[PDB]
Amino acid sequence: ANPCCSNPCQNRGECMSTGFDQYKCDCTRTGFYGENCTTPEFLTRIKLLLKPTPNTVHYILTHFKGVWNIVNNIPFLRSLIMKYVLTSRSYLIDSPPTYNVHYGYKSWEAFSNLSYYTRALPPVADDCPTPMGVKGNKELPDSKEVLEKVLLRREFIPDPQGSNMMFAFFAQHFTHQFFKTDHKRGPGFTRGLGHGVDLNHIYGETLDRQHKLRLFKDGKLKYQVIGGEVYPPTVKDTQVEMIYPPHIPENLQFAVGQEVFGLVPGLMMYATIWLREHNRVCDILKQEHPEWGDEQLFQTSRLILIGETIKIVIEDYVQHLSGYHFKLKFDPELLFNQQFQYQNRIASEFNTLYHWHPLLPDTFNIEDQEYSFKQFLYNNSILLEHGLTQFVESFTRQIAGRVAGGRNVPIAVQAVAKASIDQSREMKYQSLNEYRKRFSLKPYTSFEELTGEKEMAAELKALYSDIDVMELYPALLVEKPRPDAIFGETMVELGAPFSLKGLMGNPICSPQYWKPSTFGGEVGFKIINTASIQSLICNNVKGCPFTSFNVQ
Amino acid sequence: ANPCCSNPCQNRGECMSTGFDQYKCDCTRTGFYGENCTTPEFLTRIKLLLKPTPNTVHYILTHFKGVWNIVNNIPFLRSLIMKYVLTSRSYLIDSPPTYNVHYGYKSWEAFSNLSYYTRALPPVADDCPTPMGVKGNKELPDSKEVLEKVLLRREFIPDPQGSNMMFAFFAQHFTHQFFKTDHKRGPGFTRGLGHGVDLNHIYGETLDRQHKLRLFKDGKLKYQVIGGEVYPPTVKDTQVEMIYPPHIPENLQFAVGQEVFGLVPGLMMYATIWLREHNRVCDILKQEHPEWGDEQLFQTSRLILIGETIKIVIEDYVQHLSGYHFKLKFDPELLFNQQFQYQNRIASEFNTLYHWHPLLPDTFNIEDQEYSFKQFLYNNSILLEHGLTQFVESFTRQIAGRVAGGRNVPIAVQAVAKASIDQSREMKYQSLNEYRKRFSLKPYTSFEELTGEKEMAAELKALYSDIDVMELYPALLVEKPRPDAIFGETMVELGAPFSLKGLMGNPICSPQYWKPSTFGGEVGFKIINTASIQSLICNNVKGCPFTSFNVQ
Ligand code: HEM
Ligand code: HEM
Ligand SMILES: *[C@@H]1O[C@H](CO)[C@@H](O[C@@H]2O[C@H](CO)[C@@H](O[C@@H]3O[C@H](CO)[C@@H](O)[C@H](O)[C@H]3NC(C)=O)[C@H](O)[C@H]2NC(C)=O)[C@H](O)[C@H]1NC(C)=O
Ligand SMILES: *[C@@H]1O[C@H](CO)[C@@H](O[C@@H]2O[C@H](CO)[C@@H](O[C@@H]3O[C@H](CO)[C@@H](O)[C@H](O)[C@H]3NC(C)=O)[C@H](O)[C@H]2NC(C)=O)[C@H](O)[C@H]1NC(C)=O
Ligand SMILES: CC(C)(C)c1cc2c(cc1Cl)C=C(C(=O)O)[C@@H](C(F)(F)F)O2
Ligand SMILES: CC(C)(C)c1cc2c(cc1Cl)C=C(C(=O)O)[C@@H](C(F)(F)F)O2
Ligand SMILES: CCCCCCCCO[C@@H]1O[C@H](CO)[C@@H](O)[C@H](O)[C@H]1O
Ligand SMILES: *[C@@H]1O[C@H](CO)[C@@H](O)[C@H](O)[C@H]1NC(C)=O
Ligand SMILES: *[C@@H]1O[C@H](CO)[C@@H](O)[C@H](O)[C@H]1NC(C)=O
Ligand SMILES: *[C@H]1O[C@H](CO)[C@@H](O)[C@H](O)[C@H]1NC(C)=O
Ligand SMILES: *[C@H]1O[C@H](CO)[C@@H](O)[C@H](O)[C@H]1NC(C)=O
């Protein structure tokens, strides 16, 4: 009987109850007034008429290759354009943060406690008649049925943007430093207390773990040689807890920063490349500074690789996803005269939307073999057999699957995609349309509008009845794609504002950090400002193989 | 060894070592260039010709009362002047933070680890030949020697600005939520992980402790009634940990946020006052929101009390130090069109500079009683015998001591003063003049200029030999005060920027937090926006006694 269950307040205003059956919207700063904040101020009307849509802005950025080439080669214009991509999205995220799984009103508990993931929209209250609020049946549809009807794979669908296994395993590698759900406490809690890109997946969370993995000479990380080739050290040597099953022998239990990376050989491939990069950067700084000791050689090297990570994510990874002919840029200076809060907190909804399991193929194709999931998982024997070089050639070739578009989730991993739906409801996620309004988008008026077709749309109607009851995770994996694109509209417009805050809100982008002495001089600063996915591979893998986040 | 020991790089330039005996300065965004960042850019010269000194500004806000009398009453103007006091300060503090006691270069470990206090200037390196880097003798003067000669009180010196014991105990009480040193680890570490105004001294550091302190009905805090007067609850009842000497009987072991507050009866005064307040705010919030439950009551009250703390801090407490005829405002909307980061980290030098033990009188005077240190400390029966009303009346009347100007630390607490000296040296603090430069003040050119007299200057020159080797903390309590003022130049110009960062950087002062609905309605917002020390006492002390931070 909470009178805010129906989400009455609009355009980002806030609902407060003023009696057992009465509510009241606080419209402050929202550019609208009236009972439910639906009447615009004069200025706000003009702003709306002149502002374009996400789908129109997408057209321009993905057409006119000749105009964008002129723009891409004038340094001054390129910067101005990129500034606009950055600034036009900051307002979409709340920072300092606000809600979480247990708090639908701003509290000190919801602000102070770094073990929760924060939330873009608050959770439906426990005393609301229906799960979404006051719309829909008493219980949501069966998740197993949604899994089977519109998510699972029949015939493999490839990414028409030509993504590959270098890209998928890099997605999985990067993200698994900040997305680390503490399943003991629940779906809405986290073990990455750094909230953002601290490279804990190489160096460890605690100080205790960090020291076990360090050599204490020349700033380096422990390692071992097998087959005349540098690999991570063992568990028997170092004492770092890893999640292996007991039938793995001692000499194959590798130790790295992220306790879970032993369970896939693609994770452990990047694992070894990033480790090699650290020790390579140690050698560079050592020559520049023979006066430096072990700690400063280490602590500076970590700063450089946080620089490299962010650089590649913006100019190779997000560049590849985007589709754009415009060349994106990592250059923190664009924000020094703007209103940016250098800070971040991981949103539950960012974790949920990044479950891109439809990328994974039915088999894994290295050299002359086709490995199955049961053969691939837990099996580092494969790595040593083939070597880093063969892995890179082979995974640059193999094509990954389409995320949006529906019905392309691998059966090996059906359990996982079902968990995504169940844990959403358990965390009390508001509906798709309330989430699209939250990020300034037009609500879908039908299931056919969502999927751009008739078969899955017809299924989804029968199961949900009202389009305003449709859920976020499933909608993302079924949404109509952009032309020859990997993703739909909702994925990108929610995904991007979350991502940019965790990349640019890193303290090394802050004015007082972003200067050459921070990283050991000009020589260091240049590693960050010329890093790429192709050089990361070439510097650290025998014979310097060609690579890319797309098939050729 | 280290070729940056002599502190070459001026104007905030950062020193780096490019080999065993050769350095380099990073002048990025300083305004200067050249080997040591000393050659000014054109606009920098121009700005230094127009900027007035801090003493010029001080004189202007403390004269012209007929002109400030009009400004105050015309709200348009008032706001423009506050916005000047707020923004003129901001360039001084590093936010995100940078250094700490172990790291004199920037590092993930220094940024990431919330257990340290931060550092405004970096530590002096270990392998430097002297304590201040290169200047002075092998070792500093004997701290006993320093303490006895210029710091200890001979005869009591009253504060010319009329500061009383209400102000003494508000200072101690208020700041002991974020100055909470971890003496097992060492002086550069903290137990206060909110690095700010979270009010852990009323509610607790951990969710564990807070729950033990709460009533779980109407959002209230637990309490007991002794002779018709409401006091905090026992340790028996709560199970919360406090620090009492063995002889204290079960019924006088009170339970409060900060575990150390039982030791001093003046602290217990304010802890009982704010507890009565919290519960008072709950009763109001229930007449308004009879729908609400226990969590939402407790949590909105705790948000409201934070705002009252900040309100009273700026418009009574800091207003009283200032001596200004102009009336300060607490208004978060003044920073909504400025660049300002909404975060903070407490800094060692803030901790050190706020050891204002010269405030303490020779005895604590209540009704017709003059209690000694020995009698006053650890003895809460004194508070139960006289009662809140009479504690307030007595403390509104009793003048506290002058801090600056020398020779006013009372003997009882001399070991504290010495420790302040010795711990600074332990934490490798730099010189006084290195700190004055850092906050854009003029370095002192002699001990006589610093003190404004002859006798202490001669004894200090005899000990230190060179003005450039003088230490920060003893300097603060020796400094020539402003005309009839409690402090001098240095204390304020370092103090104010650190503090405004802790007041205004509070998450409750951002755009998304600062609006009626965060505080449960317009009623709740009114309780912050008309808060004062006078009303805090009036509503929570029997007979609404008159109070103030200065003797009539
Ligand atoms: C063979 C490779 C993979 C396997 C075996 C796998 C399987 C799993 C499993 C079992 C979970 C735990 C879910 C739960 O218990 O509820 C998980 C989490 C997750 N996966 Fe994968 N997945 C793989 C590849 C990927 C890829 C390519 C991505 C794309 C970036 C991805 C994204 C995620 C995300 C975001 C989570 C949640 C992380 C967290 O909250 O802790 N996964 N995966
Ligand atoms: C009148 C009774 C007081 C006594 C007996 C006293 C004595 C002491 C002692 C023994 C310590 C170190 C041990 C501890 O943490 O308990 C200390 C530290 C300190 N004192 Fe006091 N003091 C008194 C009042 C004040 C006042 C009026 C102020 C004014 C602001 C003040 C400011 C501080 C500060 C900021 C610290 C450092 C605390 C920390 O870092 O944890 N004290 N004092
Ligand atoms: C961030 O929020 C979390 C959720 O509130 C806190 O984690 C919770 O800490 C509680 C104790 O401080 C646990 O409460 C349980 O309480 C009973 C009653 O006293 C105890 O017997 C139980 O042992 C205790 N724990 C368990 C596991 O039963 C909560 O369980 C615990 N976690 C969860 C998921 O609820 C964090 O402490 C908080 N952060 C901070 C700094 O306080
Ligand atoms: C933030 O900073 C603090 C300083 O680095 C950390 O506190 C230190 O944690 C260490 C744990 O790794 C303690 O180590 C002691 O010393 C040896 C070193 O080899 C260990 O084996 C011992 O087990 C350990 N204990 C004893 C009794 O020797 C440090 O002593 C400890 N304290 C201090 C004052 O330095 C914090 O851990 C750190 N937090 C994080 C998250 O990084
Ligand atoms: C808007 C634009 C340029 C297309 C864009 C696309 C992005 C990202 C950022 C931007 Cl600005 C970051 C992404 C990530 O971090 O994975 C992904 C995202 F789908 F959002 F998840 O693609
Ligand atoms: C510049 C002006 C207005 C005089 C000023 C004075 C202050 C403070 C803030 C300002 Cl803006 C805060 C203070 C504190 O927190 O105790 C003290 C300080 F001495 F600085 F420590 O007095
Ligand atoms: C009450 C604390 C003083 C006892 C310790 C002896 C310190 C001696 O110090 C002397 O004190 C004289 C009298 O105040 C001053 O005139 C001298 O300048 C000073 O050197
Ligand atoms: C693991 O990989 C090895 C090496 O190719 C292979 O022979 C073996 O069958 C795999 N083991 C399992 C349990 O699948
Ligand atoms: C504390 O003061 C009271 C008077 O209020 C006195 O009776 C008592 O002796 C003192 N207590 C102790 C433990 O010294
Ligand atoms: C808000 O709009 C109007 C009042 O202007 C009212 O008819 C409507 O019922 C209000 N809110 C909802 C959720 O219907
Ligand atoms: C910096 O100042 C000048 C260079 O202009 C040089 O003579 C001097 O020795 C340098 N170092 C120091 C410590 O002043």
Swiss-Prot record, chains A, B:
EC number: 1.14.99.1
Domain EGF-like: 1-38
Heme in keyword set: yes
Glycan attachment residues as annotated in the record: 36, 113, 379
One MF annotation (Gene Ontology) recorded for this entry: peroxidase activity
Disulfide bonds, paired cysteine numbers: 4-15, 5-128, 9-25, 27-37, 538-544
Record membrane topology: Peripheral membrane protein
Tissue expression summary: Following colon injury, expressed in the wound bed mesenchyme during the first phase of repair, probably by colonic mesenchymal stem cells (at protein level).
UniProt modified residues of type O-acetylserine: 548
Physiological role: Dual cyclooxygenase and peroxidase in the biosynthesis pathway of prostanoids, a class of C20 oxylipins mainly derived from arachidonate, with a particular role in the inflammatory response. The cyclooxygenase activity oxygenates arachidonate (AA, C20:4(n-6)) to the hydroperoxy endoperoxide prostaglandin G2 (PGG2), and the peroxidase activity reduces PGG2 to the hydroxy endoperoxide PGH2, the precursor of all 2-series prostaglandins and thromboxanes.
Name this protein carries in UniProt: Prostaglandin G/H synthase 2
Gene: Ptgs2
